[PDB]
Design a protein around this ligand. Structure first.
Ligand SMILES: Nc1ccn([C@H]2C[C@H](O)[C@@H](COP(=O)(O)NP(=O)(O)OP(=O)(O)O)O2)c(=O)n1
Ligand SMILES: [Mg+2]
Ligand SMILES: [Mg+2]
Ligand code: NA
Ligand code: NA
Length: 326
DNA sequence: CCGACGTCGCATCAGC
DNA sequence: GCTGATGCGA
DNA sequence: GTCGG
């Protein structure tokens, strides 16, 4: 927490560029810089000192000098007083409302929470659930609740078919004391890179979790990815738990290590690792690591028998999940 | 300087 | 309906 | 916005 003021400022600039300017690579730039500063183990004294870090260039060094001298950033102070930016930045906090739909809504005069609640019929299904649980989805999940949720998911999955394996990934697998949501990696021996010997493998699991009233809403659902809402059960006279976001990803059982590497994250860790892979002549997705030809076309999948095999290919020392929180 | 920035699933829409 | 592009998100 | 060719 040494450089919290600086990393907050950068994150808010990143959010501005994503939501308002619609400049994804500036969003990624600010986020990478925020990340590299967050793990820097000194209280930063100057923009110059920060500029030595990879991802911090001239412009962010100048903003850090301003922030350190004054405690504020004029650029942000203006963004905060702009009405369209404030409106757009608010609307994009609803799940399913991105930068384009947020700017469209403002254009139509829909720009507050009360506007959204009067105009549900202008929301698609994902956005309407995001509005429904707007407050709940802002709350973090204590790891103790994550452990209860893990218990339910794993036991309900076992009841469907004892050959399922469910692994909780994301920030939970990295050991976080609180999580934004729950991420569940699912495998089953009938679904491999070579064949799908059983249909509805994801569906059967979703259905069981709805049957026990753990899953309460569905944001999207395909053959391999489910995005929805869940809720722990509460006891008599107890206030209910908040509703939580839950993502379930069915991955071919022989591609578990690539899948669990992907789903463990962090998101910035994945970006950095896949960028480094490219620099080493490989491409990594959630299924495989493959060589790059000089052509520039991916080759055949390389053998992978642990997450560490993937690190070895790109000549990275292994990093445990808890050390991937970039 | 300047091209290039990780990789993909599901929802939705345009065009045929 | 199919295909491909765009939005949004993991 | 940053960085490597
Ligand atoms: N842009 C993104 C977003 C997510 N992911 C992967 C890495 C994440 O750890 C995993 C799940 O995404 P997530 O739930 O939004 N983030 P994560 O679980 O790390 O932290 P929380 O905010 O959920 O506590 O998907 C990715 O590879 N690229
Ligand atoms: Mg998560
Ligand atoms: Mg998630
Ligand atoms: Na730098
Ligand atoms: Na949003």
């Amino acid at each position: 927490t040494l450089n919290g003021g600086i990393t907050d400022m950068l994150t808010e600039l990143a959010n501005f560029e994503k939501n308002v300017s619609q400049a994804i690579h500036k969003y990624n730039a600010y986020r990478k810089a925020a990340s590299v500063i967050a793990k820097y183990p000194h209280k930063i004294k100057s923009g110059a000192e920060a500029k030595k870090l990879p991802g911090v260039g001239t412009k962010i060094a100048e903003k850090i000098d301003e922030f350190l001298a004054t405690g504020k950033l004029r650029k942000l102070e203006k963004i905060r007083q702009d009405d369209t930016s404030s409106s757009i930045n608010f609307l994009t906090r609803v799940s399913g409302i991105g930068p384009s739909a947020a700017r469209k809504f403002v254009d139509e005069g829909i720009k507050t929470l009360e506007d959204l609640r009067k105009n549900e019929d202008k929301l698609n299904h994902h956005q309407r659930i995001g509005l429904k649980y707007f407050g709940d989805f802002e709350k973090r999940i204590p790891r103790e609740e994550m452990l209860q949720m893990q218990d339910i998911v794993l036991n309900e999955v076992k009841k469907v078919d004892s050959e399922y394996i469910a692994t909780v990934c994301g920030s939970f697998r990295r050991g976080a004391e609180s999580s934004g949501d729950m991420d569940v990696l699912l495998t089953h021996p009938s679904f491999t890179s070579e064949s799908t010997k059983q249909p509805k493998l994801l569906h059967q699991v979703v259905e069981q979790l709805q049957k026990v009233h753990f899953i309460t809403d569905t944001l999207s659902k395909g053959e391999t990815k489910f995005m929805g809402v869940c809720q722990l059960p509460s006891k008599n006279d107890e206030k209910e738990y908040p509703h939580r976001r839950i993502d379930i990803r069915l991955i071919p059982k022989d591609q578990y290590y690539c899948g669990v590497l992907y789903f463990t994250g962090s998101d910035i860790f994945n970006k950095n690792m896949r960028a480094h892979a490219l620099e080493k002549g490989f491409t990594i997705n959630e299924y495989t690591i493959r060589p790059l030809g000089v052509t520039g076309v991916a080759g055949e999948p390389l053998p992978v028998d642990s997450e560490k095999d993937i690190f070895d290919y790109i000549q990275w020392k292994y990093r445990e999940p808890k050390d991937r929180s970039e």
